[PDB]
Design a protein around this ligand. Sequence first.
Ligand SMILES: O=C(O)Cc1cccnc1C(=O)O
Lengths: 280, 285
Amino acid sequence: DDNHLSIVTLEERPFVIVEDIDPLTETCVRNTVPCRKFVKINNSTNEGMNVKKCCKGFCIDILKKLSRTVKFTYDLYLVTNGKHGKKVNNVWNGMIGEVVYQRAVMAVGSLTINEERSEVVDFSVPFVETGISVMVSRGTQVTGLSDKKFQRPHDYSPPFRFGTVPNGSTERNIRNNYPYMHQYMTRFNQRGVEDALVSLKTGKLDAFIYDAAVLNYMARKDEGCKLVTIGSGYIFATTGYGIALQKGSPWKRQIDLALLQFVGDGEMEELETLWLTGIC
Amino acid sequence: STRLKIVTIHQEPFVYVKPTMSDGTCKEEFTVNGDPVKKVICTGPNDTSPGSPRHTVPQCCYGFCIDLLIKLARTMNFTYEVHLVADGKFGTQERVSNKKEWNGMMGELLSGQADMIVAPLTINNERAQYIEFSKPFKYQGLTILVKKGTRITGINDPRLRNPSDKFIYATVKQSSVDIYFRRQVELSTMYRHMEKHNYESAAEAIQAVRDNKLHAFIWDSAVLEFEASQKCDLVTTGELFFRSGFGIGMRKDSPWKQNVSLSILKSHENGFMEDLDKTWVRYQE
Ligand SMILES: O=C(O)Cc1cccnc1C(=O)O
């Protein structure tokens, strides 16, 4: 009971991957774990139902290890109110909000550690390195975020076309650090990573600014190896993914030590090889 | 209350250590960007040889970690005094008897000779059991330093995995790399090779590679890549074969720990850490 924890996650391949459950068995097989998703009946009601799904990927493998090593059981669910975490009128949504408002004991997923999130949740040690990277077509001449094509976009004719996926740690950072770039960028907001890669490949976008761990993976997987991150995969505002816990959580110490043991004993490299490899 | 006792260690480019001038102050110098170099007085032993008395002397300290300390002290409004770790070591737990004991900066933090470690101090399981680490102020890893001309592939090179006395490699005693090779049974063959040749300090190891007395030095990538950028007879090979971060070290009940970590995050996010990288780490090639 006290050892059985509500845990929240969010699909973001390859770190978390969501598949439909076998209708004939209603059982998750192979390397997957049960994860449920509250799905609305209609838009004129608050009624919904929990749909049984199955989850796998790099952070799911981390969760299974933590569950075995720290000795807990869990009911994993997928967030439905936002995504990673954003503060709206001083109210947190996404995985962060689930934790802040005690609907989950922890958030396990591709959850970026930053300062304003750390004011409302406790984060584990980082277990995957990330930050902010820039994806372009190969040969695009852009030094980085501080490139003048980004900072002073209208100093060029035609101006550089570049966007991010809004409402996560990347946009929060750009808004705080580069006001003119941020207000220029918003017209190029992309609904998600797959849209952004299509926009790049078809010439609708010159650059895509986003989470380094996801972009570096998408680069290694790109069909034909045409899309690259700048600076051989350079990262601005280096940070990592962390497990988010409630402030003062008594699980933090054992989670931290477990993750550090996984790193120290080489177990993390096996997961990286399993989930994060590509032929570019 | 009291001024915080900061313990650090000599380790360029994070911590430079130089003599004071005659009058006991530190010489005015200017960075690659033209800005004054912030120096602090740091007391430390002048005799660093093993088994000798450790009577201390005022010296000058500066570099990436000293700039970071200054930013922390201004941000959270503490005063401080800096000293160099007496035994010259980062810190491991060793058997004494059935008791165990921490040496180096870890030992000083735990015994209260220090209140905060500000150093290129790797975060690892063994130390986290005893002290509190900040979120990493620097992400890096391990790589391998060799004389130019020496060809080895990396951590899986047969001259490392099937070792002989013809090709000697080593790391620093009582360091996180020492712990790493002792911890993993898969690395035990290399561990037993290195335990005959480990050096008291990184600078001594690096010099032994220049003098063709050490064929390979396994050490932190933030340090080795800086050395390879200044000494063009030395190179790294194989890229990072393990990834780890440096964090600030405090006792688990420090009142400062939440605000230290938040300041580190803030500094990654607003470009301060990048500025430090441009000033101290990445500027030559
Ligand atoms: O980087 C973003 O803006 C969104 C994002 C993308 C991948 C992983 N984490 C996040 C996050 O905000 O936690």
